Design an enzyme around this catalytic site. Structure first.
Site, PDB file in Angstrom:
ATOM      1  N   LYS A   1       0.862  -1.177   0.000  1.00  0.00           N
ATOM      2  CA  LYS A   1       0.000   0.000   0.000  1.00  0.00           C
ATOM      3  C   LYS A   1       0.898   1.226   0.000  1.00  0.00           C
ATOM      4  O   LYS A   1       1.464   1.592   1.032  1.00  0.00           O
ATOM      5  CB  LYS A   1      -0.920   0.011   1.214  1.00  0.00           C
ATOM      6  CG  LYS A   1      -1.971  -1.070   1.238  1.00  0.00           C
ATOM      7  CD  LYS A   1      -2.896  -0.869   2.426  1.00  0.00           C
ATOM      8  CE  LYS A   1      -3.999  -1.915   2.473  1.00  0.00           C
ATOM      9  NZ  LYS A   1      -4.902  -1.694   3.638  1.00  0.00           N
TER      10      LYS A   1
ATOM     11  N   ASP B   1     -18.435   1.805   9.875  1.00  0.00           N
ATOM     12  CA  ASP B   1     -18.587   1.179   8.564  1.00  0.00           C
ATOM     13  C   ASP B   1     -18.344  -0.317   8.739  1.00  0.00           C
ATOM     14  O   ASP B   1     -17.284  -0.854   8.415  1.00  0.00           O
ATOM     15  CB  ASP B   1     -17.630   1.787   7.546  1.00  0.00           C
ATOM     16  CG  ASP B   1     -18.021   1.452   6.124  1.00  0.00           C
ATOM     17  OD1 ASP B   1     -19.123   0.899   5.932  1.00  0.00           O
ATOM     18  OD2 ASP B   1     -17.217   1.700   5.206  1.00  0.00           O
TER      19      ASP B   1
END
Lengths: 104, 271, 63, 63, 37
Positions: B111, B198
């Site tokens: 990432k 979430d």
RNA sequence: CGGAGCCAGCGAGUCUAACCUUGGCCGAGAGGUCUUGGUAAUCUUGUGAAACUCCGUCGUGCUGGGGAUAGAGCAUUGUAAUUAUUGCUCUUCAACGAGGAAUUCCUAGUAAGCGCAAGUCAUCAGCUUGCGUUGAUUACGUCCCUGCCCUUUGUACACACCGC
């Protein structure tokens, strides 16, 4: 229209051509349940059998089921020509087949 | 070794001032002649690893996103990490996710963070360090989560996990224990002091080991949404987590709860 | 329920962070002697009529 | 099952001041298709009084 | 297919005149489609 | 879904070729046959488009919503259709119960929904452009986010010491 009421005499689930059919939908959309048979096919079969298709499938006598089965095994003899059937102009036999539900 | 060391030196010639002129990259390197410094800076600029800002009477050198990660690769040459680079699975907002491999040959996840002159780099650095410390906190508490390998100043290299999201998962056989799991895990979140708002279908990742032993786990990636219980709006955040689990299990798994689910007032006697 | 009836007499401008709320000077409808400063969300022209609930609340400025 | 669905139409329609398409399916005895047949049949009998008629919704009144 | 100056890039293939959008704006002041609005 | 009513406009059309096609018969259709009109405000054309209006069937049920996938044949253009160019008929009827982190555009016939025409066109669009039909909500305020600039000038420590 006229509310024509029946003292029972209808069966909830019928069985035809070795397949369960719900005797509460219109007869077109109750015979659409089985494989190899769609909307317009059951519609044209029951018009050749002169079946009142605004009547549900619980108010249908088994003699009309026999008529529908007779049009199943004889579509081309009852003025339903070759464009309307499943397997037109085969390679194995050269004929026109309407492949039924459990015979696939 | 030597060219990477001098590139580390001009990396260390960035934490001195603002936008760095030419003779500072000449002298911080401390190399022999005009040759090495100037041809290195030209190799940087032609590979877009550096840029020229000419503000009046003043040459200066502007580092873009390109000429950093090599040093991170050098920083990851130090820490036994990746040798081969590049397979795109997921271009996120605050990171770009790649599938990479080490010298050992195991595929890993790279990432890179892109969040110029100092602040893009430095805020990517703060984001990578913050996410690495949050991953460390989750693994230290014992949460089932991917294991971090390293956080090469602004690029996080971690493991790959054989999972697929729950939107393509029809059901399992042990549905009420899965509901008790996805209730008790949000209970464990409230016992940590946090609420991951979430908690959707795309978050929850299931690894699938076997079909007989049933020794599997989960992966929860909700990092810029975890909110402490002391904040203003955590009540319906917790309730949105619980009720998204319940509405998914009613819609997809066709499961309704027989035990009543936990409230925020239920979990106020937790941590 | 005290339904406060109000009158717009003087607009003060556009305030709020987004630049959406309006500071409005208010002649109280039942008693003329009250002049209030209120915060109105929406389009208001001069000599309009408002429906407040509290005549006694006044807010200085907004951000 | 003819004499223990049909006459409850004849009890409920004079009860209800407002009889339409989907305030007559709601009795949970009948389908939404034959309900309009019962509507036209009570038009012919006279317990249902026509207010206005559309091909998707028809407004009536008890007698 | 460009049959004028071998200029396939951007043919205007409409009506068979077949001029590229570079050379169509070269020869724009010979046909008559010019700037009005 | 099944009938009925049938409302536009921008275009575009054939020569030393096969363009746009009206009409009539055949075919379930695809399509085919026979011609005719128009080099065009004339014929196609009043392009009888779609969305729309009305009446019946359905009755909330992954249903009569959906149409993805697959089988069978039949026709059309193309020399050549196989990894199906495409069109027609019947059958097979999948995920998908208003959708996350995040993202785009927008103030009146504008949005949105709808189709049509023209270029890509040998055959088809989910490609691009113009046209017309029906036609909202809500601002008409702000620089609070996003930025973009425009400036004002505190200044270069005019490069100083160091620990390192």
């Amino acid at each position: 229209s006229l509310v024509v009421q029946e003292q029972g005499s209808f069966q909830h689930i019928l069985r035809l051509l070795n397949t369960n059919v719900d005797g509460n939908i219109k007869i077109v959309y109750a015979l659409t349940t089985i494989k190899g048979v769609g909307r317009r096919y059951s519609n044209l079969v029951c018009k050749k059998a002169d079946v009142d298709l605004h009547k549900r499938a619980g108010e249908l006598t088994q003699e009309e089921l026999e008529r529908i089965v007779q049009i199943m095994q004889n579509p081309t003899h009852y003025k339903i020509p070759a464009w309307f059937l499943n397997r037109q102009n085969d390679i194995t036999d050269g004929k026109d087949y309407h492949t039924l539900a459990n015979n696939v | 070794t030597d060219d990477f060391r001098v590139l580390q030196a001009v990396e260390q010639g960035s934490r001195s001032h603002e936008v760095v002129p030419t003779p500072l990259i000449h002298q911080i390197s401390g190399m022999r002649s005009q040759s090495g410094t100037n041809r290195a800076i030209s190799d940087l600029a032609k590979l877009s690893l550096i840029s020229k800002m000419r503000n009046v009477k003043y040459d200066g050198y502007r580092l873009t996103y390109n000429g950093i990660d090599y040093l991170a690769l050098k920083t990851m040459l130090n820490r036994d990490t990746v040798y081969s680079v590049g397979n795109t699975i997921g271009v996120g907002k605050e990171s770009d996710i790649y599938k990479v491999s080490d010298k050992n040959g195991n595929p890993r996840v790279m990432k890179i963070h892109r969040l110029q002159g100092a602040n893009w780099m430095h805020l990517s650095r703060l984001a990578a360090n913050k996410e690495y410390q949050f991953m460390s906190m989750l693994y230290s508490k014992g949460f089932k989560v991917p294991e971090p390998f390293d956080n090469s100043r602004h690029i996080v290299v971690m493991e790959l996990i054989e999972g697929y999201p729950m939107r393509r998962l029809r059901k399992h056989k042990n549905i009420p224990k899965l509901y008790s799991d996805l209730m008790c895990f949000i209970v464990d979140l409230a016992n940590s002091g946090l609420i991951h708002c979430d908690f959707n279908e795309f978050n929850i990742m299931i690894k699938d080991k076997l079909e007989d032993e049933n020794d599997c786990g989960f992966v929860v990636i909700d990092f810029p949404q975890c909110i402490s219980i002391q904040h203003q709006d955590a009540d319906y955040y917790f309730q949105r987590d619980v009720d998204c689990i319940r509405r998914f299990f009613k819609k997809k798994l066709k499961y309704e709860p027989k035990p009543d689910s936990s409230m925020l007032d239920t979990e106020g006697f937790g941590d | 329920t005290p339904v406060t009836l109000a009158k717009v007499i003087k607009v003060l401008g556009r305030t709020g962070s987004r630049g959406g709320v309006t500071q409005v000077r208010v002649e109280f409808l039942e008693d003329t002697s009250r002049t209030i400063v209120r915060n109105v969300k929406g389009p208001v022209r001069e000599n309009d009529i408002l429906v407040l609930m509290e005549s006694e609340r006044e807010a200085r400025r907004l951000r | 099952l003819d004499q223990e669905k049909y006459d409850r139409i004849l009890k409920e329609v004079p009860t209800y001041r407002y009889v339409s398409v989907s305030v007559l399916v709601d009795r949970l005895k009948i389908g939404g298709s034959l309900a309009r047949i019962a509507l036209r049949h009570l038009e012919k009998e006279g317990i249902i009084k026509p207010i206005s008629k559309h091909s998707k919704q028809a407004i009536y009144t008890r007698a | 297919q460009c049959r004028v100056c071998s200029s396939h890039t951007g043919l205007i293939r409409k009506y068979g005149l077949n001029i590229c959008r570079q050379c169509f704006r070269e020869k724009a002041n010979d046909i008559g489609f010019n700037k009005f609005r």
